[PDB]
Design a protein around this ligand. Structure first.
Ligand SMILES: Nc1ncnc2c1ncn2[C@@H]1O[C@H](COP(=O)(O)OP(=O)(O)OP(=O)(O)O)[C@@H](O)[C@H]1O
Ligand SMILES: Nc1ncnc2c1ncn2[C@@H]1O[C@H](COP(=O)(O)OP(=O)(O)OP(=O)(O)O)[C@@H](O)[C@H]1O
Ligand SMILES: [Mg+2]
Lengths: 257, 252
């Protein structure tokens, strides 16, 4: 660990290392490294915390997940590098299935992800090891899915997802929840609930939420879901980024700080 | 067809396959994209403005050098050579994660589009003080003796250092708030894949201008105001996106 606990970018920097390792364990694609950067820049803009518009989406997503009939949490190379333990914990609290789901699928990459998750829960049912069914639209099996998971699923969480896949799953009729720091991504705009938070914070938080909201009665959960407006929430995120820009600038930019 | 975004993602990845571009550089590419999303993935007027002023400055320079790192080599090898010849400037390979293998990789990739181009920074012998040895190497006939350097996609410490050395520094950076963007004398907030073709085309035309008209452009240019204008662009844009809403819309 090449930097000090006092460092103002400590956590950011720590996760950069985690996604690098991820790659050289065979988990995270190169393309994923670019996506990690995309996330970094936007986190910095958002303020590297869980903003209210994100808290709001997460209350609603967890309620929707808890009322679901066959909820699946997806995993890919980035998630496996960054929050292997927390994704298991979240799937456990939801009693949701975990399905590995990649755009750059490989038996090798699939196996690296599996082994990494097993490190944390050797017992865990993993789906998408050998996926038979496929999503209408998409492409050369860059849209392959397991038949006992996302194929079957009414409600999916698809973190850090590609826009083609999010939009396609919606057209199937899946209720899609995404976690994505970029509110302007196609995936963010096409999801049913879009949580604009870093997944390193979103998952542990959704886990806390699920642990409290388990005790909520159905009607309570349905009130939350029915109140929720994903359009206003995205709009609130853009204006939040807008206002942090004018705050970061103030006192002038050029030379320097 | 988000074609070009994807096209350049492949280029940066091939960049690392070729040994030209480091892992950090892939993250950095992603950061760039994030800001390109905010700006609207085009060349806005304040970047057009900075690029004019930059090209003027470069055409009046005595010892102009355009610098190349792993990311620039992956994205615009062809165009970086064109820009240099059009400016009559030297080309220096200059990068943070310096490796003989990566330098060679970059050299060959540049030699593809111009086998007879002279490449500085193959074995630089001078250093910028106040950095590290491997962050800080500069070539005796290039950056060391330059009055004007173009350093795209640059670490803020190197930029600031070069300014400490009395170099007039021009940068291309999609992040208007970066250390490097704050420290440069002229900051072009644009995608390099856009900025370089554009500057090449500006150089060909502004060669026709009087020295006097170039000096005027140089002296009117205000990098502080220009960066504020890039933020105002961004803010008004987000304000307009929000008012209209974005959820479930195909194109923004
Ligand atoms: N640590 C993180 N926490 C949360 N989200 C992140 C993190 N790292 C990256 N992301 C987001 O995950 C997404 C990955 O999806 P992808 O790479 O397909 O984006 P895209 O191709 O630009 O958008 P689209 O495919 O929707 O047009 C990115 O939008 C990125 O911002
Ligand atoms: N295609 C591109 N066009 C223009 N600017 C880009 C492009 N890709 C990346 N950039 C910008 O180049 C800079 C990349 O440099 P980087 O952030 O890696 O250096 P650094 O600031 O020294 O490192 P760190 O930010 O981790 O301290 C970022 O500001 C990024 O926005
Ligand atoms: Mg930076």
């Amino acid at each position: 660990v090449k930097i000090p606990k006092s460092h103002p970018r400590y956590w950011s920097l720590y996760y950069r290392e985690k996604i690098i390792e991820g790659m050289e364990k065979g988990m995270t694609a190169k393309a994923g490294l670019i996506a990690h950067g995309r996330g970094e820049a936007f986190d910095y803009l958002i303020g590297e915390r869980t903003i209210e518009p994100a808290e709001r989406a997460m209350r609603a997503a967890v309620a929707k997940l808890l009322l679901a009939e066959n909820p699946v949490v997806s995993v890919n190379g980035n998630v496996a590098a960054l929050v292997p333990k927390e994704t298991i914990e979240l799937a456990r609290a939801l009693n949701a299935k975990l399905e590995i789901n990649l755009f750059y699928r490989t038996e090798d990459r699939v196996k690296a992800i599996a082994e990494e998750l097993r490190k944390y829960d050797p017992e865990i049912e993993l789906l998408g090891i050998n996926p038979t069914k496929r999503i209408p639209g998409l492409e050369h099996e860059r849209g392959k899915v397991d038949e006992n998971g996302i194929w079957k699923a009414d409600v999916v969480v698809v973190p850090l997802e590609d826009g083609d896949r999010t939009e396609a799953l919606v057209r199937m009729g899946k209720f899609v929840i995404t976690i994505d720091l970029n509110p302007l991504s196609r995936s963010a705009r096409m999801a049913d609930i879009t949580i604009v938070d870093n997944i390193v914070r979103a998952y542990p938080r959704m886990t806390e939420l699920a642990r409290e909201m388990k005790d909520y009665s159905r009607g309570e959960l349905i009130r939350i879901i029915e109140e929720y407006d994903n359009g206003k929430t995205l709009n609130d995120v853009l204006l939040h980024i807008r206002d942090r820009l004018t705050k970061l600038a103030e006192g002038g930019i050029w030379r320097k700080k």
